[PDB]
Amino acid sequence: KTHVQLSLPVLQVRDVLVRGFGDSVEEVLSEARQHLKDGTCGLVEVEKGVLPQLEQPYVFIKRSDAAPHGHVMVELVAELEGIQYGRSGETLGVLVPHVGEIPVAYRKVLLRK
């Protein structure tokens, strides 16, 4: 399937134990896709002061379209020193590894895979 329905646990930035997916744009997109498949991906909602508390490169989910079965259609865009790899809509948040942090909410998305 080109799209996969996921419910991503929303984590508080200060709870996140592993604050990024790796060291290159290509690695973080690779790792983010692997974690999304394995159900070990969390989402941090971007506000003032969030991104400086996480590790670059960043992986964003961005709205790819205007929402089947309550699930917003999204795609992955990486960012490193202010350059984005990918072009998409509004950020729904930043993806991080989930290693058992308690979420505050769930974000229903349809992921272009």
Curated annotation (Swiss-Prot):
Annotated CoV Nsp1 globular domain residues: 2-113
* Residue range from the parent sequence: 11 to 125 of 7096
Question: Where does this protein reside within or beyond the cell?
Answer: Host cytoplasm
Which residue ranges are recorded for the region named Disordered? 1-113
Question: What this chain does, per the record?
Answer: Inhibits host translation by associating with the open head conformation of the 40S subunit. The C-terminus binds to and obstructs ribosomal mRNA entry tunnel. Thereby inhibits antiviral response triggered by innate immunity or interferons. The nsp1-40S ribosome complex further induces an endonucleolytic cleavage near the 5'UTR of host mRNAs, targeting them for degradation. This inhibits the integrated stress response (ISR) in the infected cell by preventing EIF2S1/eIF2-alpha phosphorylation upstream of stress granule formation and depletes host G3BP1.
The protein in question is named Host translation inhibitor nsp1
